[PDB]
Structure 1
Amino acid sequence: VGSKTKEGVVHGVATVAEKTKEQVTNVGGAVVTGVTAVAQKTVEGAGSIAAATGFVKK
């Protein structure tokens, strides 16, 4: 077989964040912020970085 396989992998990531401000006001939601490397490998489901699937009575 001799089979290499990479599922859902993050390699080699350099980041410099300098004097970044940030402000979040959230109510019942999903929020994702900033420097964001993401590998996903979902099987038989909903892959998703920000998911908001609920009721909010404001």
Structure 2
Amino acid sequence: HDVATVAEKTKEQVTNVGGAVVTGVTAVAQKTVEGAGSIAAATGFVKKD
């Protein structure tokens, strides 16, 4: 509707609506993931039906 990100003299700013936003550092190191229907290393992530 009326979402807003208002400022001045900033560095970073985000306004997501209903999705996914990834803007940072990340590191994953699996070694073994078993089973079916398994999410292993998901960072920014939405999911429905």
TM-score (norm 1): 0.29
CA distance change for structure 1 residues 31 and 55 in 2, over 3 Å: closer, same or farther?
A: closer
Aligned length: 48
Q: Which runs of 5+ in 1 are unaligned?
A: 1-10
* Identity percentage of aligned residues: 98
Q: Which runs of 5+ in 2 are unaligned?
A: none
In structure 1, what is the Cα distance between the partners aligned to 2:31 and 2:2?
18
TM-score (norm 2): 0.32
CA distance change for structure 1 residues 57 and 12 in 2, over 3 Å: closer, same or farther?
A: closer
Higher RCO by CA contacts (8 Å cutoff, separation 6 or greater): 1
Is the strand fraction higher in 1 or 2? Answer: 1
TM-align CA RMSD: 12.9
